[PDB]
Design a protein around this ligand. Structure first.
Ligand code: 0WW
Ligand code: 0WW
Ligand code: ZN
Ligand code: ZN
Lengths: 354, 354
């Protein structure tokens, strides 16, 4: 397999479906990347794979604090440490964490790229600043411009490390808040540097779905068509569907994991909160169509009891179902685009989910 | 399969190995019964089975509080609820929880037997009082005598319920603290009532291993030889080995589960506390010989990090290993008795473990 190859197999409107080939595996797009600490909280890596995940997001910020990037490198890298042998996309650390050098809390672009190398990342994110929302045109500009300088520094750091350059991929991140002109400048700067993939940053930060979609409408076409498009931090099932309708290929969110241990279960009829008394004697599975192991074997009533009781097994089961649900959503999206019926799928999905 | 059949296949001294056949499965003896809430905290039932468990102990006291025995019955019984289709031994509720009728906190022998029926227990424990330690001869006597009256009430309650009598088994529990004469009176009273199996109660309550063993030395021979002998609440690996040397066939303890999530891992070289700094870069498995999935796939260093970080996956992995370790200990015990080399196994085990 190559270091990195993105191929688009089918299209519908702005939506695309295809594959990213990398040395550690193939990634089906549009892709949902479960987020970890633990490939995913409360799941073994084999269970994460069983749900259909092709790639996971590695939480750099946590790992760089403990056990430490250098320690993980000494122990053989994050894949070996965790027991996940497929691709890992690492975050830069820069959302969870100010000067032109970087952020003191020193995390600079060079140190971020180095930490991602030490973990053994397959897809490395450039170090940026997620501009707060709302932002004035001035602040958004200043922020975006710094991020583009940091993007160039990221590129050079990555390229100056042979083993990283030969075996990993590097994504750049577009900024510019909600302003079309800044989004364009950013896209232009990133394409001049050149990356393997392009993220849309600076969204899912308080603006709401209507505004997020409006910005996606003009921002995604600015990115190179022939490279994957990653929407950072998104999101709820309806947000994913709409983003795919606007040309996004990749997603990450802590929602399924977070919400799960919370008691929220995703279903094709919308989310349910399994702690509700209404479920205490409900023998149906979390969702009537879901193919996951949890829906094959346990009832709402059981999981209701476990979550109310604060049982670890409740978190395990809720998380496995919710990650499986997201994977099934991505599979339905891929299949519908492949078959030229994604517009209809989006309409049917929303009709029932809401 | 029969309702209940205990067969002894081999002996060595007072140690025995054999099988209990029941409608839901076969139980290899000497047996370790993992304890639940969740067949075992942090494990799916398939994982519990994978470790080698033939039977689990169902925590009646917790379940009778929530979700409630009647609710579990309405939902199809504990096996269906939990997803464990093999035998379950239910506790009476009476240790975790005073008049001749029962205990108010009303839990009486009749209500205990009824709750165990409602859960769908395979092996039902008579309702007793675990006499506190130390106890004066008077108090121990009075306590034991009440327990024997409660044993008779338990027997009658069980027998008056056709479906329970035909499909489950009933164990009586010997009391009498550390006094040989009271232990004998108790054994005599239980054998007159007649049970399918006999537990040694009133130990592992502060007396220490030397005294526990001294009491076992005279108490177990008082019980019918042809029925299984259950030592309640025991225990640490060395306690299990010594108890088997004294004729015990069955054990339960929360130690492997409890200790595990605590950071204590059992090994053939003794227990280790995986949170110790000494393990932070140790790439060996928890134990060098253990056949469990955890020791096949993850390092000490990884599990060290997970437990220090408070990760659920740390509890999952520690628990699976520790329950597997106990099952491997019971298998080694069974095999060594079957081969007439259990005395040597006990000596070799202790030499290395200590
Ligand atoms: O411009 C951005 N640059 C870089 N990272 C961003 C992130 C982090 C994405 N996942 C982080 C994971 C790394 C591993 C640990 C867990 C997070 C974002 N997350 C969101 N929305 C999240 C939210 C959605 C709804 C409320 S907040 N917008 C984001 C924008 C950016
Ligand atoms: O005479 C007894 N009658 C009935 N139950 C007893 C129990 C409970 C055994 N497992 C309970 C499980 C039921 C499901 C929930 C979890 C417990 C005992 N546990 C101990 N030692 C425990 C201890 C060992 C070391 C310190 S305390 N001695 C016991 C003596 C008796
Ligand atoms: Zn499911
Ligand atoms: Zn092990």
């Amino acid at each position: 397999r190559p270091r990195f190859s993105f191929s688009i197999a089918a299209r519908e409107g702005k939506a695309r479906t295809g594959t990213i080939e990398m040395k550690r595996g193939v990634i089906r797009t549009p892709a949902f990347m479960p987020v970890g600490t633990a490939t995913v909280k409360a799941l073994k890596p084999e269970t994460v794979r069983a749900t259909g995940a092709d790639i996971i997001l590695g939480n750099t910020y946590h790992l760089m604090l403990r056990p430490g990037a250098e320690r993980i490198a000494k122990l053989g890298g994050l894949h070996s440490f965790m027991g996940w042998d497929r691709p890992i996309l690492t975050d830069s650390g820069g959302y969870q964490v100010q000067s032109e050098e970087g952020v003191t809390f020193m995390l600079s672009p060079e140190r971020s790229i180095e930490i991602q190398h030490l973990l053994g990342s397959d897809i490395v994110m450039a170090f940026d600043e997620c501009t707060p929302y709302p932002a004035t045109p001035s602040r958004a500009a200043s922020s975006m411009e710094r991020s583009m300088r940091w993007a160039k520094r990221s590129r050079d750091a990555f390229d100056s490390r042979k083993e990283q350059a030969e075996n990993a991929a590097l994504f750049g991140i577009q900024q510019g808040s909600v302003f079309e002109n800044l989004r364009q400048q950013s896209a232009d700067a990133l394409a001049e540097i050149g990356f393997d993939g392009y993220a849309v940053g600076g969204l899912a930060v308080g603006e709401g779905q209507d505004e997020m979609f409006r910005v996606l409408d003009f921002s995604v076409p600015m990115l190179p068509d022939d490279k994957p498009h990653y929407l950072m931090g998104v999101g709820k099932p309806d947000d994913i569907v709409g983003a795919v309708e606007r040309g996004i290929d990749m997603f990450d969110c802590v929602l399924p994991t977070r919400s799960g241990r919370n008691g929220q279960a995703f279903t094709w009829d919308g989310p349910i909160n399994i702690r509700n008394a209404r479920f205490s004697e409900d023998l149906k599975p979390l969702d009537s169509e879901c193919h996951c192991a949890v829906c094959q074997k346990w009832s709402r009533a059981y999981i209701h009891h476990l979550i109310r009781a604060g049982e670890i097994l409740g978190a395990m089961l809720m998380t496995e179902h919710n990650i499986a649900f997201y994977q099934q959503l991505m599979q339905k999206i891929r299949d519908s685009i492949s078959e030229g019926r994604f517009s209809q799928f989006a309409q049917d999905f929303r009709a029932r989910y809401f």
